[PDB]
mmCIF file with all atom_site columns, C-alpha atoms in Angstrom:
data_model
loop_
_atom_site.group_PDB
_atom_site.id
_atom_site.type_symbol
_atom_site.label_atom_id
_atom_site.label_alt_id
_atom_site.label_comp_id
_atom_site.label_asym_id
_atom_site.label_entity_id
_atom_site.label_seq_id
_atom_site.pdbx_PDB_ins_code
_atom_site.Cartn_x
_atom_site.Cartn_y
_atom_site.Cartn_z
_atom_site.occupancy
_atom_site.B_iso_or_equiv
_atom_site.pdbx_formal_charge
_atom_site.auth_seq_id
_atom_site.auth_comp_id
_atom_site.auth_asym_id
_atom_site.auth_atom_id
_atom_site.pdbx_PDB_model_num
ATOM 1   C CA . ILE P 1 1  ? -143.884 22.736 -114.548 1.00 17.70 ? 500 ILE P CA 1
ATOM 2   C CA . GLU P 1 2  ? -141.173 24.411 -112.396 1.00 16.52 ? 501 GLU P CA 1
ATOM 3   C CA . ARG P 1 3  ? -137.547 24.525 -111.506 1.00 16.98 ? 502 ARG P CA 1
ATOM 4   C CA . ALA P 1 4  ? -136.434 23.315 -115.086 1.00 18.08 ? 503 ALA P CA 1
ATOM 5   C CA . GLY P 1 5  ? -132.870 23.194 -115.277 1.00 19.27 ? 504 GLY P CA 1
ATOM 6   C CA . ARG P 1 6  ? -133.161 24.306 -119.091 1.00 16.28 ? 505 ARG P CA 1
ATOM 7   C CA . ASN P 1 7  ? -136.173 25.429 -121.154 1.00 13.91 ? 506 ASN P CA 1
ATOM 8   C CA . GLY P 1 8  ? -139.342 24.980 -119.544 1.00 13.38 ? 507 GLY P CA 1
ATOM 9   C CA . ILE P 1 9  ? -141.253 23.858 -122.758 1.00 14.99 ? 508 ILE P CA 1
ATOM 10  C CA . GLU P 1 10 ? -138.881 22.935 -126.050 1.00 16.90 ? 509 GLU P CA 1
ATOM 11  C CA . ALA P 1 11 ? -140.524 21.782 -129.413 1.00 20.20 ? 510 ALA P CA 1
ATOM 12  C CA . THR P 1 12 ? -137.985 20.902 -131.841 1.00 14.22 ? 511 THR P CA 1
ATOM 13  C CA . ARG P 1 13 ? -138.072 19.508 -135.303 1.00 10.77 ? 512 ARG P CA 1
ATOM 14  C CA . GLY P 1 14 ? -141.457 20.177 -136.243 1.00 12.52 ? 513 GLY P CA 1
ATOM 15  C CA . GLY P 1 15 ? -143.098 18.295 -132.877 1.00 12.70 ? 514 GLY P CA 1
ATOM 16  C CA . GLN P 1 16 ? -146.129 20.380 -132.041 1.00 13.08 ? 515 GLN P CA 1
ATOM 17  C CA . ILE P 1 17 ? -147.198 20.572 -128.184 1.00 13.79 ? 516 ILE P CA 1
ATOM 18  C CA . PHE P 1 18 ? -150.503 21.405 -126.873 1.00 14.84 ? 517 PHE P CA 1
ATOM 19  C CA . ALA P 1 19 ? -151.222 23.650 -123.636 1.00 13.61 ? 518 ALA P CA 1
ATOM 20  C CA . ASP P 1 20 ? -154.052 25.624 -122.104 1.00 13.36 ? 519 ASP P CA 1
ATOM 21  C CA . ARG P 1 21 ? -153.106 26.847 -118.857 1.00 11.72 ? 520 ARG P CA 1
ATOM 22  C CA . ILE P 1 22 ? -150.050 25.679 -117.915 1.00 11.36 ? 521 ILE P CA 1
ATOM 23  C CA . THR P 1 23 ? -147.836 27.256 -115.383 1.00 11.72 ? 522 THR P CA 1
ATOM 24  C CA . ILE P 1 24 ? -144.316 27.619 -116.034 1.00 13.52 ? 523 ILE P CA 1
ATOM 25  C CA . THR P 1 25 ? -142.060 28.920 -113.100 1.00 11.53 ? 524 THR P CA 1
ATOM 26  C CA . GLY P 1 26 ? -138.047 29.093 -112.537 1.00 10.78 ? 525 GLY P CA 1
ATOM 27  C CA . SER P 1 27 ? -136.776 27.865 -115.923 1.00 9.79  ? 526 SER P CA 1
ATOM 28  C CA . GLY P 1 28 ? -133.136 27.706 -116.505 1.00 8.72  ? 527 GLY P CA 1
ATOM 29  C CA . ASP P 1 29 ? -133.572 29.091 -120.014 1.00 9.88  ? 528 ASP P CA 1
ATOM 30  C CA . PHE P 1 30 ? -136.877 30.024 -122.320 1.00 10.21 ? 529 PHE P CA 1
ATOM 31  C CA . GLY P 1 31 ? -140.132 29.267 -120.631 1.00 11.57 ? 530 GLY P CA 1
ATOM 32  C CA . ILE P 1 32 ? -141.463 28.611 -124.392 1.00 12.25 ? 531 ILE P CA 1
ATOM 33  C CA . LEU P 1 33 ? -139.294 27.441 -126.921 1.00 13.24 ? 532 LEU P CA 1
ATOM 34  C CA . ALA P 1 34 ? -140.156 26.857 -130.717 1.00 11.40 ? 533 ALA P CA 1
ATOM 35  C CA . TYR P 1 35 ? -137.762 25.313 -133.000 1.00 9.80  ? 534 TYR P CA 1
ATOM 36  C CA . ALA P 1 36 ? -139.503 24.788 -136.404 1.00 11.15 ? 535 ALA P CA 1
ATOM 37  C CA . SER P 1 37 ? -142.300 23.383 -134.081 1.00 8.27  ? 536 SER P CA 1
ATOM 38  C CA . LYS P 1 38 ? -145.539 24.731 -133.059 1.00 5.76  ? 537 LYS P CA 1
ATOM 39  C CA . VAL P 1 39 ? -146.870 25.362 -129.436 1.00 4.54  ? 538 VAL P CA 1
ATOM 40  C CA . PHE P 1 40 ? -150.138 26.015 -128.407 1.00 5.77  ? 539 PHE P CA 1
ATOM 41  C CA . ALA P 1 41 ? -151.199 27.972 -125.169 1.00 4.94  ? 540 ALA P CA 1
ATOM 42  C CA . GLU P 1 42 ? -154.147 29.996 -124.753 1.00 5.95  ? 541 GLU P CA 1
ATOM 43  C CA . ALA P 1 43 ? -153.390 31.096 -121.366 1.00 5.66  ? 542 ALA P CA 1
ATOM 44  C CA . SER P 1 44 ? -150.164 30.766 -119.377 1.00 3.85  ? 543 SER P CA 1
ATOM 45  C CA . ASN P 1 45 ? -148.348 31.815 -116.206 1.00 3.05  ? 544 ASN P CA 1
ATOM 46  C CA . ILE P 1 46 ? -144.632 31.835 -117.261 1.00 3.23  ? 545 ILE P CA 1
ATOM 47  C CA . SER P 1 47 ? -142.498 33.123 -114.445 1.00 3.10  ? 546 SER P CA 1
ATOM 48  C CA . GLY P 1 48 ? -138.970 33.302 -113.445 1.00 3.50  ? 547 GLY P CA 1
ATOM 49  C CA . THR P 1 49 ? -137.702 32.586 -116.700 1.00 5.44  ? 548 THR P CA 1
ATOM 50  C CA . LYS P 1 50 ? -133.713 33.433 -116.596 1.00 5.39  ? 549 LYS P CA 1
ATOM 51  C CA . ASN P 1 51 ? -133.827 34.137 -120.529 1.00 3.57  ? 550 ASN P CA 1
ATOM 52  C CA . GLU P 1 52 ? -136.764 35.622 -122.705 1.00 5.18  ? 551 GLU P CA 1
ATOM 53  C CA . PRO P 1 53 ? -140.026 33.829 -121.915 1.00 5.04  ? 552 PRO P CA 1
ATOM 54  C CA . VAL P 1 54 ? -141.286 32.937 -125.402 1.00 3.29  ? 553 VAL P CA 1
ATOM 55  C CA . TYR P 1 55 ? -138.888 32.123 -128.027 1.00 6.36  ? 554 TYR P CA 1
ATOM 56  C CA . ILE D 1 1  ? -137.314 8.689  -151.104 1.00 8.26  ? 500 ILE D CA 1
ATOM 57  C CA . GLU D 1 2  ? -136.024 8.211  -154.354 1.00 7.04  ? 501 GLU D CA 1
ATOM 58  C CA . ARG D 1 3  ? -137.343 7.689  -158.129 1.00 8.59  ? 502 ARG D CA 1
ATOM 59  C CA . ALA D 1 4  ? -140.791 8.252  -157.411 1.00 6.12  ? 503 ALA D CA 1
ATOM 60  C CA . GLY D 1 5  ? -143.120 8.001  -160.119 1.00 2.00  ? 504 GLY D CA 1
ATOM 61  C CA . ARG D 1 6  ? -144.889 11.216 -159.165 1.00 2.00  ? 505 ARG D CA 1
ATOM 62  C CA . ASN D 1 7  ? -144.425 14.070 -156.547 1.00 3.63  ? 506 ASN D CA 1
ATOM 63  C CA . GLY D 1 8  ? -142.352 12.476 -153.798 1.00 4.81  ? 507 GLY D CA 1
ATOM 64  C CA . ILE D 1 9  ? -144.185 13.942 -151.109 1.00 2.97  ? 508 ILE D CA 1
ATOM 65  C CA . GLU D 1 10 ? -147.620 14.520 -150.980 1.00 3.78  ? 509 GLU D CA 1
ATOM 66  C CA . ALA D 1 11 ? -150.130 15.952 -148.069 1.00 5.57  ? 510 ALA D CA 1
ATOM 67  C CA . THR D 1 12 ? -153.509 16.142 -149.682 1.00 6.67  ? 511 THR D CA 1
ATOM 68  C CA . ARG D 1 13 ? -157.094 17.321 -148.334 1.00 4.89  ? 512 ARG D CA 1
ATOM 69  C CA . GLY D 1 14 ? -155.698 18.335 -145.147 1.00 4.23  ? 513 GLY D CA 1
ATOM 70  C CA . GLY D 1 15 ? -153.343 16.356 -142.868 1.00 5.58  ? 514 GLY D CA 1
ATOM 71  C CA . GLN D 1 16 ? -149.941 17.009 -141.766 1.00 2.00  ? 515 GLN D CA 1
ATOM 72  C CA . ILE D 1 17 ? -146.334 15.286 -142.502 1.00 2.00  ? 516 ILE D CA 1
ATOM 73  C CA . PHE D 1 18 ? -143.648 15.485 -140.215 1.00 2.00  ? 517 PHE D CA 1
ATOM 74  C CA . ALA D 1 19 ? -140.230 15.572 -141.569 1.00 2.00  ? 518 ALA D CA 1
ATOM 75  C CA . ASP D 1 20 ? -136.587 16.828 -140.123 1.00 2.00  ? 519 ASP D CA 1
ATOM 76  C CA . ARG D 1 21 ? -133.876 15.543 -142.372 1.00 2.00  ? 520 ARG D CA 1
ATOM 77  C CA . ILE D 1 22 ? -135.755 13.855 -145.137 1.00 2.00  ? 521 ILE D CA 1
ATOM 78  C CA . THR D 1 23 ? -134.017 13.068 -148.636 1.00 2.00  ? 522 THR D CA 1
ATOM 79  C CA . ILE D 1 24 ? -135.594 13.095 -151.866 1.00 2.00  ? 523 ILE D CA 1
ATOM 80  C CA . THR D 1 25 ? -134.148 12.243 -155.142 1.00 2.00  ? 524 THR D CA 1
ATOM 81  C CA . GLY D 1 26 ? -135.210 11.570 -158.816 1.00 2.00  ? 525 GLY D CA 1
ATOM 82  C CA . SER D 1 27 ? -138.877 12.226 -158.170 1.00 2.00  ? 526 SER D CA 1
ATOM 83  C CA . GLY D 1 28 ? -140.870 12.267 -161.369 1.00 2.00  ? 527 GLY D CA 1
ATOM 84  C CA . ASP D 1 29 ? -142.887 15.416 -160.151 1.00 2.00  ? 528 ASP D CA 1
ATOM 85  C CA . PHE D 1 30 ? -143.109 18.236 -157.452 1.00 2.00  ? 529 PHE D CA 1
ATOM 86  C CA . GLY D 1 31 ? -140.524 17.428 -154.874 1.00 2.00  ? 530 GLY D CA 1
ATOM 87  C CA . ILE D 1 32 ? -142.898 18.363 -152.069 1.00 2.00  ? 531 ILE D CA 1
ATOM 88  C CA . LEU D 1 33 ? -146.607 19.150 -152.600 1.00 2.00  ? 532 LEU D CA 1
ATOM 89  C CA . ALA D 1 34 ? -149.255 20.358 -150.190 1.00 2.00  ? 533 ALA D CA 1
ATOM 90  C CA . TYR D 1 35 ? -153.198 20.911 -150.706 1.00 2.00  ? 534 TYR D CA 1
ATOM 91  C CA . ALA D 1 36 ? -154.510 22.857 -147.913 1.00 2.00  ? 535 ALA D CA 1
ATOM 92  C CA . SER D 1 37 ? -152.361 21.034 -145.651 1.00 2.00  ? 536 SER D CA 1
ATOM 93  C CA . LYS D 1 38 ? -149.360 21.424 -143.624 1.00 2.00  ? 537 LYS D CA 1
ATOM 94  C CA . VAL D 1 39 ? -145.784 19.863 -144.351 1.00 2.00  ? 538 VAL D CA 1
ATOM 95  C CA . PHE D 1 40 ? -142.731 20.153 -142.217 1.00 2.00  ? 539 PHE D CA 1
ATOM 96  C CA . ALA D 1 41 ? -139.493 19.416 -143.640 1.00 2.00  ? 540 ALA D CA 1
ATOM 97  C CA . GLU D 1 42 ? -136.544 21.478 -141.628 1.00 2.00  ? 541 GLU D CA 1
ATOM 98  C CA . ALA D 1 43 ? -133.676 20.148 -143.417 1.00 2.00  ? 542 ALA D CA 1
ATOM 99  C CA . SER D 1 44 ? -134.881 18.585 -146.430 1.00 2.00  ? 543 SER D CA 1
ATOM 100 C CA . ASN D 1 45 ? -132.396 17.547 -149.328 1.00 2.00  ? 544 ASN D CA 1
ATOM 101 C CA . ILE D 1 46 ? -134.616 17.909 -152.228 1.00 2.00  ? 545 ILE D CA 1
ATOM 102 C CA . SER D 1 47 ? -132.440 16.883 -155.498 1.00 2.00  ? 546 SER D CA 1
ATOM 103 C CA . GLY D 1 48 ? -132.932 15.403 -159.081 1.00 2.00  ? 547 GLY D CA 1
ATOM 104 C CA . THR D 1 49 ? -136.539 16.771 -159.196 1.00 2.00  ? 548 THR D CA 1
ATOM 105 C CA . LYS D 1 50 ? -138.208 17.086 -162.546 1.00 2.00  ? 549 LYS D CA 1
ATOM 106 C CA . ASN D 1 51 ? -140.830 19.708 -161.514 1.00 2.00  ? 550 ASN D CA 1
ATOM 107 C CA . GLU D 1 52 ? -140.770 22.370 -158.799 1.00 2.00  ? 551 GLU D CA 1
ATOM 108 C CA . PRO D 1 53 ? -139.372 21.170 -155.709 1.00 2.00  ? 552 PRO D CA 1
ATOM 109 C CA . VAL D 1 54 ? -141.620 22.913 -152.973 1.00 2.00  ? 553 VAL D CA 1
ATOM 110 C CA . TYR D 1 55 ? -145.147 23.404 -153.962 1.00 2.00  ? 554 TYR D CA 1
#
């Protein structure tokens, strides 16, 4: 993922998201956002996040 | 979910039950029950439960 206008990854209302080595770049908001939902990322390359990377 | 004869939600023996604004009412037993299992209910509206609502 790259150049996201908003959160690079958003998981809302209990929706799990699987990820292993996903590269995140230039997101408008939090690169990874958990909203009562799980997110898995064994590795990552979160970069260029205007707000806090992991939320 | 209304007027259940037993626990209005049940995740047993594993498994997951997704829920966001789920409404329960009048359940005969536990409003939400879990046996080694995940249950997600962000904004549940448990009501009229005879036994303990969340278990």
